[PDB]
Amino acid sequence: CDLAALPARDKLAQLLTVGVTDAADARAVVADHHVGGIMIGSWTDLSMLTDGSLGDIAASAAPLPLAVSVDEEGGRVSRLASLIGSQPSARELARTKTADEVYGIALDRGRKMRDLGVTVDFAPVVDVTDAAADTVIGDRSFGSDPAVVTEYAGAYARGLRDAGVLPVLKHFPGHGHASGDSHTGGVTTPPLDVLMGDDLVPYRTLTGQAPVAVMVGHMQVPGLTGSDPASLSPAVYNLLRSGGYGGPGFGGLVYTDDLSSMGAINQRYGVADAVLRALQAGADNALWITTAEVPAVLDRLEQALASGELNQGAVDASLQRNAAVKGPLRC
Numbered sequence: 001c002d003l004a005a006l007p008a009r010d011k012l013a014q015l016l017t018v019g020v021t022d023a024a025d026a027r028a029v030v031a032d033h034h035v036g037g038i039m040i041g042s043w044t045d046l047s048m049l050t051d052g053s054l055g056d057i058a059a060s061a062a063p064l065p066l067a068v069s070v071d072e073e074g075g076r077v078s079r080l081a082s083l084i085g086s087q088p089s090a091r092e093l094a095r096t097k098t099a100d101e102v103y104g105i106a107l108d109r110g111r112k113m114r115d116l117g118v119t120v121d122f123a124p125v126v127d128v129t130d131a132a133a134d135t136v137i138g139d140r141s142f143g144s145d146p147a148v149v150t151e152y153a154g155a156y157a158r159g160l161r162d163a164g165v166l167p168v169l170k171h172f173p174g175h176g177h178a179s180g181d182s183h184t185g186g187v188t189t190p191p192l193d194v195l196m197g198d199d200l201v202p203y204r205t206l207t208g209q210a211p212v213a214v215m216v217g218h219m220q221v222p223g224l225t226g227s228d229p230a231s232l233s234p235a236v237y238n239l240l241r242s243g244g245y246g247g248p249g250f251g252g253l254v255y256t257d258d259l260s261s262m263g264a265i266n267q268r269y270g271v272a273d274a275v276l277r278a279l280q281a282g283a284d285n286a287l288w289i290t291t292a293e294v295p296a297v298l299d300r301l302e303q304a305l306a307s308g309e310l311n312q313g314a315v316d317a318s319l320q321r322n323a324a325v326k327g328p329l330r331c
């Protein structure tokens with residue numbers, strides 16, 4: 001069989017990653033809708049990772065293998081800690097460990113994630129900040145110095161990668177100096193010309209170390225996105241694809257941050273509209289944290305194809321990128 005010959009709706013479902021509550025929720029969304037990815041979060045019953053159910057669902061996934069993602073950064077964001085042990089925050093690692101030690105920590109934890117069926121970790125954070133530890137980014141950042149972030153997040157990404165986990169650099173083009181918490185409402189970064197010399201620095205080297213993905217956040221960026229969240233602005237994706245951000249143009253997989261529960265998005269757009277806008281803007285993978293909306297979202301995406309709101313080429317390019325980080329088609 002042939003990737004380009006899949007039914008339109010299954011091509012579209014491959015561009016979605018959705019949070020699941022338990023095995024029954026994951027089993028239904030994968031079999032009924034063929035979503036490309038499921039996400040494990042704080043809302044997830046983790047017994048599915050140890051009782052054989054994730055393995056069973058993943059093995060019957062078709063036409064592409066299932067991607068299984070999680071926020072496993074360490075410190076305050078460590079959804080698998082009960083199973084893989086806790087790790088100090090990114091900031092504490094940078095303060096107490098060498099970069100080689102951080103590589104080893106990420107490698108060890110990556111293998112522990114693989115054992116549980118995880119394929120994608122939404123880490124490392126490459127945001128640069130000096131904010132108080134328990135703020136939106138805060139201690140999730142490896143440091144206030146972009147060169148330190150590059151060294152330490154680079155090591156963390158390399159460890160995950162060597163374990164065979166896809167690392168995802170976040171939150172592009174930089175949440176570290178944003179005006180507030182995008183979970184609760186709209187936020188603004190410093191202008192692009194400021195980001196160019198600071199927040200964007202880590203991406204210049206880290207996006208070229210493959211396999212790697214990037215996640216775009218919901219901040220508004222002056223001089224780039226205007227009043228649009230970055231995840232929903234074509235300018236953001238053009239910046240990443242063209243090399244305009246100061247590094248080589250990035251051709252790999254690009255996720256959005258959570259499109260449903262986060263106020264920066266949901267106060268302006270419902271889930272289906274937000275997913276459409278993201279894929280129009282240039283995301284390869286639209287992420288949100290529930291499965292209920294999937295059939296309505298797929299309905300809206302098919303309509304956008306018909307109306308030309310969404311170009312067939314955008315879908316095909318992103319379908320290829322999603323397939324490129326997975327195993328073979330299942331015919």
Ligand code: NA
Pocket residue numbers: 279282283284313314315316317318
């Ligand atoms: Na696309």
